[PDB]
Paper text:
The α-D-phosphohexomutases are ubiquitous enzymes found in all kingdoms of life. Among other reactions, these enzymes catalyze the reversible conversion of 1-phospho to 6-phosphohexoses, with various sugars including glucose, mannose, glucosamine, and N-acetylglucosamine. In bacteria, the enzymes phosphoglucomutase (PGM) and phosphomannomutase/phosphoglucomutase (PMM/PGM) are involved in the biosynthesis of exopolysaccharides that contribute to the pathogenicity of infections in higher organisms, including humans, animals, and plants. The reaction mechanism of the α-D-phosphohexomutases is conserved, and entails two phosphoryl transfers [Fig. 1(a)], with the initial transfer occurring from a phosphoserine residue of the enzyme to a monophosphorylated sugar to form a bisphosphorylated intermediate (e.g., glucose 1,6-bisphosphate or G16P).
The structure of apo-XcPGM was determined with both the phosphorylated (EP; active) and unphosphorylated (EdeP; inactive) states of the catalytic serine. To obtain phospho-enzyme crystals, the purified protein was phosphorylated with G16P prior to crystallization and crystals grown at 4 °C to limit spontaneous hydrolysis of the phosphoserine. Overall, the structures of EP and EdeP are very similar, with a Cα root-mean-square deviation (RMSD) between polypeptide backbones of 0.26 Å. A small shift in the backbone between these two structures is evident in loop (i) and several other regions near the site of phosphorylation [Fig. 3(a)]. In EP, one of the phosphate oxygens takes the place of the serine hydroxyl and coordinates the metal along with the aspartates in loop (ii). A structural shift of loop (i) between EP and EdeP has not been observed in other enzymes in the superfamily, although only a few have been crystallized in both states. In PC1, a distinct separation is seen between the two apo structures (triangles) and the ligand complexes (circles). This variation is the most significant in the data set, consistent with the obvious conformational change of loop (iv) upon ligand binding.
Numbering used by the authors: 1 to 448
């Protein structure tokens, strides 16, 4: 067959049958063969098995003559940042994301933190690994421990004017992932009053695997915001490349609205810039970008597509509705830290609460959120939807699945390639009733 752990965009599998130290070592050998010259940055998340997987990567890389820069326990964005900042040949983050306790994985980048994906080197690595029966060589290169975060912290702080920040009270919820370490290193340089929830890194996850999208986990941040009168709350996934916002009422802010909000924050600092966004939910972003003087650039969803498009357009910022925010100055990479710093600055400077910054936008472009449908036949299910609506003559766009614009409402319907699974997003022009009736109509068709 093929090694199942090699996915479209990263490596992910059950330990030890899909991913283990031997495979990790072979991946390091294969990665050395795929990169231009230079050292390789390695970091890892809080999962208990992550360090051993990193050590195996390092052994394979060093056997292949690659100097290894061990940045230690970190966030995925720190591997991206250090790979670019240190002008490394590439980098690997060992991270299991929100997969089960017996899973782990790896995210791999080349120069400037450019993604390595299935069609840009990852399956080449897979095929090399799959055929590698060579004896493990011994190291011919060194490993250096580089735990200085100064340049990374200075870079994060460079997105805000610290003299304009107010002493907001912010709930922070690392979910026992790694975000608290960075929050605590930033805190001496900021005026905020932090309320720390599930703050200590703990790969045993006594409070659940970090995933702020699950209602039980969502509610822990909401409750802390409400009980403490916080201005807003921020939660992260375990490797903290995704952040999640809760307004002063405890309400979780759907990620769609953060794209337009962050674009308007960034466009104040880089006037006339291009902003890349995905096709699932669009109308609010296009309007907010244009109103702020930027140029919106439609792009297929998925971090590799977003990053490539930002590069080709010199786009200052790119944002996906699914809590991914990318910054040109950050090597075009995603950060779960930059967004909350920008939002805290916007609340501080504007005098407006996070709730009021988004309220009118959510009313003007209400959306369904992303709704997933396991179906027996994705192609037949999409066909049923498109047949049902054909007589309305929607404007169709095929940038990412099917987008259908009917005038006062639109949807995007995307099909998973890993399993028969359709993802639906609907939005309307200020009409909650139409949003629900159309969402339910499409849902009935997809389940047919
Ligand atoms: Ca993540």
């Amino acid at each position: 067959m093929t090694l199942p752990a090699f996915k479209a965009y990263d490596i992910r599998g059950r330990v030890p049958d899909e991913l283990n130290e031997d495979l990790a070592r072979r991946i390091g050998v294969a990665l050395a063969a795929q990169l231009d010259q230079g050292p390789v940055v390695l970091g890892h998340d809080v999962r208990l098995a992550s360090p051993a997987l990193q050590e195996a990567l390092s052994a394979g890389l060093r056997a292949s003559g690659r100097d290894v820069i061990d940045i230690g326990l970190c966030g995925t964005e720190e591997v991206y940042f250090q790979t670019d900042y240190l002008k490394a040949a590439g980098g690997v983050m060992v991270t299991a994301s929100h997969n089960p306790m017996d899973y782990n994985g790896m995210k791999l980048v080349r120069e400037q933190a450019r993604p390595i994906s299935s069609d840009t080197g990852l399956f080449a690595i897979r095929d090399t690994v799959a055929a590698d029966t060579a004896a493990p060589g011994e190291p011919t290169a060194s490993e250096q421990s580089r735990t200085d975060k100064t340049a990374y912290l200075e870079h994060l702080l460079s997105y805000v004017d610290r003299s304009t920040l107010k002493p907001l009270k912010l709930v922070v919820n690392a979910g026992n992932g790694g975000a608290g370490l960075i929050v605590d290193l930033l805190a001496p340089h900021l005026p905020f009053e932090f309320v720390r929830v599930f703050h200590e890194p703990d790969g045993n996850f006594p409070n659940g695997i970090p995933n702020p999208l699950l209602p039980e986990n969502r509610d822990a941040t909401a409750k802390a915001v409400k009980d403490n009168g916080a201005d807003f709350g921020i939660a992260w996934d375990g490797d903290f490349d995704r952040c999640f916002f809760f307004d002063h009422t405890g309400r979780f802010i759907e990620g769609y609205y953060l794209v337009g909000l962050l674009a308007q924050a960034i466009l104040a600092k880089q006037p006339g810039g291009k902003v890349v966004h995905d096709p699932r939910l669009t109308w609010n972003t296009v309007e907010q970008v244009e109103e702020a003087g930027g140029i919106p650039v439609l792009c297929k969803s998925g971090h590799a597509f977003i990053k490539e498009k930002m590069r080709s357009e010199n786009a200052v910022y790119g944002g996906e509705m699914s809590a991914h925010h990318y910054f040109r100055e950050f090597a075009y990479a995603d950060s779960g830290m930059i967004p909350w710093l920008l939002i805290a600055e916007l609340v501080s400077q504007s005098g407006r609460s996070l709730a009021d910054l988004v309220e009118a936008r959510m009313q003007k472009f209400p959306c369904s959120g992303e709704i997933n449908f396991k179906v027996a036949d994705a192609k037949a299910s999409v066909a049923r939807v498109m047949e049902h609506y054909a007589s309305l003559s929607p404007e169709l766009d095929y940038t990412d699945g099917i987008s259908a614009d009917f005038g006062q409402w639109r949807f995007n319907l995307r099909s998973s390639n890993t399993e028969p699974l359709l993802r639906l997003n609907v939005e309307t022009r200020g009409d909650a009733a139409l949003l629900e009736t159309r969402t339910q109509e499409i849902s009935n068709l997809l389940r047919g």
